[PDB]
């Protein structure tokens, strides 16, 4: 497919009574998890989660394990530094969350990169779109920004986002092409469930699709309707594919004027479903 991304997500959660934080790292290409690290697990290694990454040799796995442990230690240090800057006690658990990655377009050239960081679920510091400077949310983050400006931290990170990140994304897309560059169009159907003797729910289903991005829209007489509708969050099936539904409540006997449209990358034209 062609727009594509590689993203990493990291969470550390402090354990104030004893020992070091819980650290979880996960890597994705588009909506496919390919690696993980969990500090609670026995291996203490970066682990594969897709068949196409298992191609990579020992030097790869050694390097990713070393780096992911380095990520974990930075998070540990940060949790201490931030507890101090916010004048918090040793009693409570706190969290840091980091996400970074890169996007390429259909031509597989760099489109954009990003790096965001949060403390206790609130924005702390993020790289701006130009990859040259930082957005600091508060005055603790501002101290970090001045430190990182002096140490030219953005310039290093930008090099990765425009360099290694997009190079290795292209590598993985090629190695996993049979799945990563395959679109799985949604399997669609409608169900119909009476709510009373005079109204019914129509539910438009989209199953087994990849990638996760999808749009389901209800229409009445061909115009969009949002009143009396419910749209659930897109959810994982557990087999690598995704599911979603959208429902509308209608007067019984009037089902035929309603249509559900389904848009997805795997469909050349949107689908139209009618009871």
């Amino acid at each position: 497919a062609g727009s594509h991304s590689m993203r990493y997500f990291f969470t550390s959660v402090s354990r104030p009574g004893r020992g070091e934080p819980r650290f979880i790292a996960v890597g994705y290409v588009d909506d496919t998890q390919f690696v993980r690290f969990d500090s609670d697990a026995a291996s203490q290694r970066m682990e594969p989660r897709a068949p196409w990454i298992e191609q990579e040799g020992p030097e790869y796995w050694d390097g990713e394990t070393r780096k992911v442990k380095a990520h974990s230690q930075t998070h540990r240090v940060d949790l201490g530094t931030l507890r101090g800057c916010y004048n918090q006690s040793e009693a409570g658990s706190h969290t840091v969350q980091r996400m970074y990655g890169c996007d390429v377009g259909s031509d597989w050239r760099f489109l954009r990169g990003y790096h965001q960081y949060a403390y206790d679920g609130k924005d702390y510091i993020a790289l701006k779109e130009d990859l040259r400077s930082w957005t600091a949310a508060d005055m603790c983050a501002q101290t970090t920004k001045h430190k990182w400006e002096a140490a030219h931290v953005a310039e290093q990170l930008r090099a990765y986002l425009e360099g290694t990140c997009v190079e290795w994304l292209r590598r993985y897309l090629e190695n996993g092409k049979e799945t990563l560059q395959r679109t799985d169009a949604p399997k669609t159907h409608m169900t119909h469930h009476a709510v009373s003797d005079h109204e019914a729910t129509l539910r438009c289903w989209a199953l087994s699709f990849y990638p996760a991005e999808i749009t389901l829209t209800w229409q009445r007489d061909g115009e969009d309707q949002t009143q009396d509708t419910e749209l659930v969050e897109t959810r994982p099936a557990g087999d690598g594919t995704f599911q979603k539904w959208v429902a509308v409540v209608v007067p019984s006997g009037q089902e035929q004027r309603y249509t559900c449209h389904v848009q997805h990358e795997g469909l050349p034209k949107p689908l139209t479903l009618r009871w």
Binding site: E64, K67, T74, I125, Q156
Partner: peptide, 9 residues
């Protein structure tokens, strides 16, 4: 492929 260095805040 992870970033090679991660600066502390």
């Amino acid at each position: 492929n992870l970033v090679p260095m991660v600066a502390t805040v």
